[PDB]
Amino acid sequence: GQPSLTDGGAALFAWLRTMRNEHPVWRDQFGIYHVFRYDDVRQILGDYQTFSSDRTRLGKGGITMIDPPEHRHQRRLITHAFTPQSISAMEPRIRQIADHLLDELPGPEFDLVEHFAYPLPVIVIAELLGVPPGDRHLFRTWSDRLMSLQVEADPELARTVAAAMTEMNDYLREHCRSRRTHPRDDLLTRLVQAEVEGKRLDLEEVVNTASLLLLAGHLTTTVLIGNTMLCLWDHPEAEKAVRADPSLIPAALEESLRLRSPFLQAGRVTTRDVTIAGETIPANRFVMAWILSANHDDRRFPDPERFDLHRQTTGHIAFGHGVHFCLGAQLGRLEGRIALERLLGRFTEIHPWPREGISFYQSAIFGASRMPVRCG
Ligand code: HEM
């Protein structure tokens, strides 16, 4: 990511455009190939046969790291329980969890990430999974100790992370063996009870699917909520129209997703040689598919750096493409919408404070880790 991520991105944007225009396929000093254009990133993401996801071979048994046909048979059991109707019924819970957050903010000057956008995705997974409310602080604890994986070295960090994972995996496991004996109406209970053509996730694939949702739908949603407030702040005409018409909160989320996509890249391993934009990547190499440049590619999104609420061309690969397309996009959108509805609903006045107090993650997640605001 060959500039500094800490000026909002303006510098990365500029660097991508050139990389797009003049090196749409680039072998980095580590042997890693990068692809920057929309058509090419999309191409890689959907062709699971050429570009494999078993990046281990140069959650190892789970859906982010296996491929079809096996990938298709496991994810169809998850989606058995992760139904779109169950995600929609989630809406009143999300609204309540966002009102509680807002009700408890520490006065009119606070950190909009720490005290709202950072906790809400975690509380929501935890209420979806069936975690009793009084256990829900333990989850916040674990996502704090585990966020190194969402972001992505030293042995120290690795060891502490592995032990946070054991802790959580024993809590979950025990918490699934109970849903087998005392079924409840949580997501957990649907997993344990899914069955497709006479097959069942075993108890461990449930645990691992649980930890996966936690860690996948957490920080991505946090930056989505942060980032969309950053877009409104950098475009006062847009924040005008959204406030005077919250009907536009969905449109604003889409454009935020394009302009400031939470997930920067996606990595596959090449299963054969292949020519991409007149460059040829050898087999058994590692490829880095820049979801962010694609979403900023002029060839398809005119004025990529402009925040337009009424773009003619839609179709951003913020959530990806192919068989691995984000299993939570539906849920993620909903979280963002409700939470923005509430936040802007509750404060006519939300200003950065200071505007130079924002800091950003440095990693695969693109957005603010700190967002001090002042409200009224
Ligand atoms: C703003 C919100 C989100 C964004 C931008 C986002 C982005 C993405 C992207 C780009 C991928 C594709 C990875 C790849 O193809 O290599 C992905 C996969 C995935 N996401 Fe999301 N995600 C979001 C929220 C969520 C949520 C809320 C959940 C669940 C609660 C979730 C669960 C997953 C899972 C399980 C996968 C892997 C699917 C598979 O490997 O077949 N994500 N996400």
Distance, in Å, from the CA atom of 263 to the CA atom of 364, rounded to the nearest integer, reads 6
Q: Crossing angle, helix 136-151 and helix 219-233, to 10 degrees?
A: 80
Distance 302 CA to ligand 1 centre (A): 26
Distance, in Å, from the CA atom of 65 to the CA atom of 267, rounded to the nearest integer, reads 11
* CA-to-CA dists, residue 258 to 86, 279, 313, 314, angstroms: 26, 27, 11, 9
Distance, in Å, from the CA atom of 165 to the CA atom of 201, rounded to the nearest integer, reads 20
Distance, in Å, from the CA atom of 173 to the CA atom of 184, rounded to the nearest integer, reads 15
Say yes or no: CB of residue 266 within 6 Å of ligand 1: yes
177 closest CA partner among 200, 198, 207, 199: 207
Instruction: Tell me, in Å, the resolution of the deposited structure.
Output: 2.4
Distance, in Å, from the CA atom of 144 to the CA atom of 138, rounded to the nearest integer, reads 10
Domain ranges of the chain: 1-376
Q: Which amino acid is at 16?
A: L
Say yes or no: CB of residue 330 within 6 Å of ligand 1: no
Tokens encoding 292: 């962010």
Neighbours of 194 (CB within 10 A): 18
332 closest CA partner among 200, 172, 194, 225: 225
Please state the atom number of ligand 1 nearest to the C-alpha of residue 121: 27
Say yes or no: CB of residue 48 within 6 Å of ligand 1: no
* Phi then psi dihedrals of residue 287, to 5 deg: -115, 140
Cis peptide before 108 (omega within 30 of 0): no
Say yes or no: CB of residue 328 within 6 Å of ligand 1: yes
C-beta separation of 253 from 348 below 8 A? no
Question: Which residue's alpha carbon is nearest to atom 35 within ligand 1?
Answer: 327
**Method underlying the structure:** X-ray
Q: Which amino acid is at 239?
A: E
Q: Give 88-92 contacts, CB < 8 A, sequence gap 24+.
A: 88/334, 90/124, 90/128, 90/331, 90/334, 91/334, 91/338
Per DSSP, the residues of 35-66 read: E-SHHHHHHHHH-TTTEES-GGG--TTSGGG-
- In 327-357, which positions are buried (b, 16+ CB within 10 angstroms) versus exposed (e)? bbbbbbbbbbbbbbbbbbeebeebebbeeee
Tokens encoding 265: 């890249």
- Angle at 161 (CA atoms; ends 158, 165), nearest 5 degrees: 135
Q: DSSP 3-state assignment of 352?
A: strand
268 is an annotated ligand-binding site residue: yes
Polymer length in residues for the chain: 376
Radius of gyration of the chain (CA): 21
Question: Residue ranges of the alpha helices (H) in the chain?
Answer: 10-22, 38-46, 70-81, 84-89, 91-103, 119-129, 136-151, 155-181, 187-193, 203-217, 219-233, 236-244, 249-259, 291-294, 329-346
337 is an annotated ligand-binding site residue: no
State the Cα torsion 122-125-129-131 to the nearest 10°.
20
Q: Crossing angle, helix 249-259 and helix 329-346, to 10 degrees?
A: 120
C-beta separation of 109 from 374 below 8 A? yes
364 closest CA partner among 151, 186, 180: 151
DSSP 8-state symbol, 375: E
335 closest CA partner among 242, 243, 233, 218: 218
Distance 124 CA to ligand 1 centre (A): 15
Please state the atom number of ligand 1 nearest to the C-alpha of residue 323: 41
C-beta separation of 92 from 100 below 8 A? no
CA 278 to chain centre: 32
292 closest CA partner among 7, 15, 46, 6: 15
Q: Which amino acid is at 264?
A: L
C-beta separation of 150 from 365 below 8 A? yes
Distance 319 CA to ligand 1 centre (A): 6
Distance, in Å, from the CA atom of 162 to the CA atom of 286, rounded to the nearest integer, reads 25
Distance, in Å, from the CA atom of 268 to the CA atom of 282, rounded to the nearest integer, reads 13
Spatial neighbors of 233 by CB under 8 A, at least 6 apart, are: 239, 352
Distance, in Å, from the CA atom of 170 to the CA atom of 165, rounded to the nearest integer, reads 9
> Which residue out of 225, 256, 326 has the highest number of ligand 1 atoms within 8 Å of its CB and is therefore the one to mutate?
326
Dihedral sign, CA of 58, 62, 64, 69? positive
Distance 328 CA to ligand 1 centre (A): 6
Dihedral sign, CA of 216, 217, 219, 221? positive
190 closest CA partner among 87, 81, 82: 81
Tokens encoding 328: 């939570």
Distance, in Å, from the CA atom of 190 to the CA atom of 238, rounded to the nearest integer, reads 41
Reported in sequence order, the residue ranges of 278-332 that DSSP labels E, i.e. its strands, are 279-281, 286-289
C-beta separation of 370 from 16 below 8 A? no
Distance 278 CA to ligand 1 centre (A): 30
- Angle at 170 (CA atoms; ends 169, 176), nearest 5 degrees: 85
Q: Which amino acid is at 166?
A: T
Q: DSSP 3-state assignment of 308?
A: coil
Say yes or no: CB of residue 63 within 6 Å of ligand 1: yes
C-beta separation of 136 from 123 below 8 A? yes
* CA-to-CA dists, residue 368 to 24, 53, 109, 208, angstroms: 28, 28, 17, 28
Say yes or no: CB of residue 263 within 6 Å of ligand 1: yes
Distance 64 CA to ligand 1 centre (A): 9
282 closest CA partner among 33, 5, 29: 33
Q: Which amino acid is at 237?
A: E
Say yes or no: CB of residue 130 within 6 Å of ligand 1: no
Pick the CATH number of 1-376 from 1.10.1060.10, 1.10.630.10, 1.10.600.10, 1.10.150.20: 1.10.630.10
Distance 210 CA to ligand 1 centre (A): 13
DSSP 8-state symbol, 365: B
C-beta separation of 90 from 331 below 8 A? yes
